[PDB]
């Protein structure tokens, strides 16, 4: 549940290292409601605007971790394409600009979304 | 010791590449020539995963900024990829592929490391270009 996510972030994602963030602070953040977001997939318009979490032509505002669902990611100068799912994450740059990738929903998504402001606020702790 | 890959798996691999990867399009390489290439012993490779040394050098298929000149498709197994300017990390499995640009040294902006024993298709630039000439003759 939230334990898998906080464990994963603290272990794999530097900006959420326990050196920088109190585990209590991290979980309290995962709980705060604006961080738990959903993306409803309109299978009628697969390329609908709201399906795009990241675009190379749009500034990175937030870090995202996929809890549930699938996204298509084209990333890097080679623009390698992948189908990514739960516990893939994006926008660490937001918490440490436009990304070198595009990320599009392929299904309903449950997401953790953390803006630079929420992160910096959580550091003031 | 070198295991014979199932002929139907190599056929599935050929159909997949011909459909999904532009450098292997039938407009560039005939499906027959591609299948023949995928059957060559040097193209069928493995990574023996050393669980007592998970960062062993032979576990790395690609390394950021290190010149490379081969394409890889994973037939079986799991890899971790760290990619892009942010070095985002995620795990990939069977029938993911890498190094297309190495077939037009290219230096990738990703690192790819085995997380398990791997069974691989490995195509070098010279093997690819030789195959393009074979499609012509």
Coordinates of C-alpha atoms in Angstrom, one line a residue:
Chain A
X1 CA 0.0 0.0 0.0
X2 CA 1.5 3.3 1.1
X3 CA 4.3 1.3 2.6
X4 CA 5.5 -0.1 -0.7
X5 CA 5.5 3.4 -2.1
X6 CA 7.4 5.1 0.8
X7 CA 9.9 2.2 0.9
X8 CA 10.4 2.4 -2.8
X9 CA 10.8 6.2 -2.8
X10 CA 13.2 6.3 0.1
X11 CA 15.3 3.5 -1.3
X12 CA 15.3 4.3 -5.1
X13 CA 14.6 8.0 -5.4
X14 CA 17.4 10.2 -4.1
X15 CA 15.4 13.4 -3.4
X16 CA 13.2 11.3 -1.0
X17 CA 16.3 9.9 0.8
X18 CA 15.8 9.7 4.6
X19 CA 18.8 12.0 4.9
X20 CA 16.7 14.8 3.2
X21 CA 13.2 13.8 4.4
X22 CA 11.8 12.4 7.6
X23 CA 10.1 9.1 6.9
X24 CA 7.2 10.5 9.0
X25 CA 7.2 13.6 6.8
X26 CA 7.3 11.5 3.6
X27 CA 4.3 9.4 4.7
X28 CA 2.4 12.4 5.9
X29 CA 3.0 13.8 2.4
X30 CA 1.8 10.7 0.6
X31 CA -1.3 11.0 2.7
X32 CA -2.1 14.6 2.0
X33 CA -4.9 14.5 -0.6
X34 CA -3.6 16.7 -3.5
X35 CA -0.8 14.3 -3.9
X36 CA -3.0 11.3 -4.6
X37 CA -4.4 12.0 -8.1
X38 CA -6.3 10.0 -10.7
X39 CA -6.3 10.1 -14.5
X40 CA -9.4 8.9 -16.1
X41 CA -8.7 7.4 -19.5
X42 CA -11.1 8.4 -22.3
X43 CA -10.7 5.5 -24.6
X44 CA -12.7 7.5 -27.2
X45 CA -9.8 10.0 -27.5
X46 CA -6.6 8.0 -26.8
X47 CA -4.5 11.2 -27.5
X48 CA -6.7 13.4 -25.3
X49 CA -4.9 16.4 -23.9
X50 CA -5.2 15.3 -20.2
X51 CA -3.6 11.9 -21.0
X52 CA -0.2 13.6 -21.4
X53 CA 1.6 13.8 -18.0
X54 CA 4.9 15.1 -19.6
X55 CA 5.8 16.6 -22.9
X56 CA 9.1 17.8 -24.2
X57 CA 7.3 21.1 -25.1
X58 CA 5.9 21.7 -21.6
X59 CA 7.8 22.6 -18.4
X60 CA 8.2 20.0 -15.7
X61 CA 6.1 21.2 -12.7
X62 CA 6.0 18.0 -10.6
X63 CA 7.3 14.6 -9.7
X64 CA 5.0 11.7 -10.5
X65 CA 5.1 8.1 -9.4
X66 CA 2.7 5.6 -11.1
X67 CA 0.7 3.6 -8.5
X68 CA -1.6 1.9 -10.9
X69 CA -2.1 1.9 -14.7
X70 CA 0.1 2.1 -17.7
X71 CA 1.9 4.9 -19.7
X72 CA 3.8 5.1 -22.9
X73 CA 7.2 6.9 -22.5
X74 CA 9.5 8.1 -25.2
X75 CA 12.7 9.2 -23.5
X76 CA 16.2 10.2 -24.3
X77 CA 18.0 11.6 -27.4
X78 CA 17.3 8.2 -29.0
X79 CA 13.7 8.6 -27.8
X80 CA 13.5 5.0 -26.8
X81 CA 9.9 4.0 -26.3
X82 CA 8.7 1.9 -23.4
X83 CA 5.4 0.8 -21.8
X84 CA 5.8 1.6 -18.1
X85 CA 3.6 0.8 -15.2
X86 CA 3.4 0.9 -11.4
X87 CA 6.4 2.4 -9.6
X88 CA 7.9 4.0 -12.6
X89 CA 8.6 7.7 -11.7
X90 CA 9.2 10.9 -13.6
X91 CA 10.1 14.5 -13.0
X92 CA 12.7 14.1 -10.2
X93 CA 14.2 17.2 -11.9
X94 CA 11.2 19.1 -10.6
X95 CA 12.4 18.5 -7.0
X96 CA 16.1 19.0 -7.1
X97 CA 13.1 23.0 -17.2
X98 CA 11.4 20.8 -19.9
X99 CA 11.9 17.0 -19.8
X100 CA 13.7 14.9 -22.3
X101 CA 10.6 12.6 -22.6
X102 CA 6.9 12.4 -23.2
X103 CA 4.6 10.3 -21.0
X104 CA 1.0 9.5 -22.1
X105 CA -1.6 7.5 -20.2
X106 CA -2.7 4.2 -21.7
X107 CA -5.3 3.4 -19.0
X108 CA -6.8 4.8 -15.9
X109 CA -4.0 5.9 -13.6
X110 CA -3.5 6.2 -9.8
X111 CA -0.6 8.6 -9.3
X112 CA 1.5 10.2 -6.6
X113 CA 2.0 13.9 -7.8
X114 CA 4.4 16.1 -5.9
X115 CA 5.1 19.7 -7.0
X116 CA 8.3 21.5 -6.2
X117 CA 6.4 23.7 -3.8
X118 CA 4.9 20.7 -1.9
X119 CA 8.4 19.2 -1.7
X120 CA 10.2 22.3 -0.6
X121 CA 7.4 22.9 2.0
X122 CA 8.0 19.3 3.2
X123 CA 11.7 20.1 3.6
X124 CA 10.8 23.1 5.9
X125 CA 10.3 20.5 8.6
Chain B
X1 CA 27.9 -25.1 -24.5
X2 CA 25.5 -23.0 -26.6
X3 CA 21.8 -23.6 -26.5
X4 CA 19.8 -23.9 -29.6
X5 CA 17.0 -21.2 -29.6
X6 CA 13.6 -22.5 -30.6
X7 CA 13.0 -21.9 -34.3
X8 CA 9.5 -20.6 -33.7
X9 CA 10.9 -18.1 -31.2
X10 CA 13.4 -16.8 -33.7
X11 CA 10.6 -16.6 -36.3
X12 CA 8.5 -14.6 -33.8
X13 CA 11.5 -12.4 -33.2
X14 CA 11.9 -11.7 -36.9
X15 CA 8.2 -10.9 -37.4
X16 CA 8.4 -8.6 -34.4
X17 CA 11.5 -6.7 -35.5
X18 CA 10.2 -6.4 -39.1
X19 CA 7.0 -4.9 -37.9
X20 CA 8.1 -2.7 -34.9
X21 CA 11.7 -1.5 -35.6
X22 CA 12.3 0.8 -38.5
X23 CA 15.9 -0.2 -39.2
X24 CA 14.6 -3.7 -39.7
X25 CA 11.6 -2.8 -42.0
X26 CA 11.2 -5.0 -45.0
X27 CA 11.9 -2.0 -47.1
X28 CA 15.5 -2.1 -45.8
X29 CA 16.0 -5.8 -45.0
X30 CA 14.1 -8.7 -46.3
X31 CA 12.3 -10.8 -43.8
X32 CA 14.2 -13.9 -45.1
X33 CA 17.6 -12.2 -44.7
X34 CA 16.6 -11.0 -41.2
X35 CA 15.5 -14.5 -40.1
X36 CA 18.8 -15.9 -41.5
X37 CA 20.7 -13.3 -39.5
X38 CA 18.9 -14.0 -36.3
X39 CA 19.8 -17.7 -36.7
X40 CA 23.6 -17.0 -36.7
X41 CA 25.4 -18.3 -33.6
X42 CA 27.2 -15.0 -32.9
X43 CA 23.8 -13.1 -32.8
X44 CA 22.5 -15.4 -30.1
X45 CA 24.1 -14.4 -26.8
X46 CA 23.5 -14.7 -23.1
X47 CA 24.4 -13.0 -19.9
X48 CA 25.1 -15.4 -17.0
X49 CA 23.9 -13.4 -14.0
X50 CA 26.3 -13.6 -11.0
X51 CA 24.0 -13.0 -8.0
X52 CA 27.1 -12.8 -5.8
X53 CA 28.2 -9.7 -7.8
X54 CA 25.2 -7.9 -9.1
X55 CA 27.3 -5.0 -10.5
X56 CA 29.7 -7.2 -12.4
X57 CA 31.0 -5.7 -15.6
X58 CA 29.6 -8.5 -17.8
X59 CA 26.1 -7.5 -16.6
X60 CA 26.2 -4.2 -18.4
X61 CA 24.8 -4.2 -22.0
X62 CA 25.1 -0.4 -22.4
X63 CA 26.9 2.3 -20.4
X64 CA 26.2 6.0 -20.6
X65 CA 28.7 7.9 -22.8
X66 CA 30.6 4.6 -23.6
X67 CA 30.9 4.0 -27.4
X68 CA 28.7 1.1 -28.5
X69 CA 28.1 -0.5 -31.9
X70 CA 25.4 -3.1 -31.4
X71 CA 21.7 -3.5 -31.1
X72 CA 20.2 -5.8 -28.5
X73 CA 16.7 -7.4 -28.1
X74 CA 16.0 -9.2 -24.9
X75 CA 14.5 -12.7 -25.6
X76 CA 14.3 -13.6 -21.9
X77 CA 15.2 -11.9 -18.7
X78 CA 15.1 -8.5 -16.9
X79 CA 17.2 -5.4 -17.1
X80 CA 17.4 -2.0 -15.3
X81 CA 17.6 1.0 -17.5
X82 CA 18.7 4.4 -16.4
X83 CA 18.1 6.9 -19.2
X84 CA 17.9 10.6 -20.2
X85 CA 19.2 13.7 -18.6
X86 CA 17.5 12.9 -15.3
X87 CA 18.7 9.3 -15.4
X88 CA 15.3 7.9 -14.7
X89 CA 15.4 4.3 -13.7
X90 CA 12.9 1.5 -14.6
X91 CA 12.9 -2.2 -15.2
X92 CA 12.3 -3.8 -18.6
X93 CA 11.7 -7.4 -19.6
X94 CA 11.4 -9.6 -22.7
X95 CA 11.3 -8.1 -26.1
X96 CA 12.5 -4.7 -25.1
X97 CA 15.3 -3.5 -27.3
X98 CA 18.2 -1.1 -27.3
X99 CA 20.9 0.4 -29.5
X100 CA 19.0 1.0 -32.7
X101 CA 21.1 4.2 -33.2
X102 CA 24.2 2.0 -33.1
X103 CA 22.9 0.7 -36.5
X104 CA 22.6 4.3 -37.8
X105 CA 30.6 5.3 -32.6
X106 CA 27.3 6.2 -31.0
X107 CA 27.4 6.8 -27.3
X108 CA 24.1 6.0 -25.6
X109 CA 22.4 8.2 -23.0
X110 CA 21.4 5.2 -21.0
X111 CA 22.9 2.4 -19.0
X112 CA 21.3 -1.1 -19.1
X113 CA 22.2 -3.7 -16.5
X114 CA 21.1 -7.3 -16.2
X115 CA 18.9 -8.2 -13.2
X116 CA 18.8 -11.9 -14.2
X117 CA 20.2 -14.4 -16.6
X118 CA 19.6 -12.9 -20.1
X119 CA 19.0 -14.5 -23.4
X120 CA 19.7 -11.9 -26.1
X121 CA 19.7 -11.1 -29.8
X122 CA 22.8 -9.0 -30.5
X123 CA 23.3 -7.4 -33.9
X124 CA 26.4 -5.4 -34.5
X125 CA 26.6 -2.5 -37.0
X126 CA 28.9 -4.6 -39.3
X127 CA 26.4 -7.6 -39.2
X128 CA 23.5 -5.2 -39.9
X129 CA 25.2 -3.5 -42.8
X130 CA 26.4 -6.9 -44.2
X131 CA 22.8 -8.0 -44.0
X132 CA 21.7 -4.9 -45.9
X133 CA 24.1 -5.8 -48.6
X134 CA 22.8 -9.4 -48.6
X135 CA 19.3 -8.2 -49.1
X136 CA 20.7 -6.5 -52.2
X137 CA 22.2 -9.7 -53.5

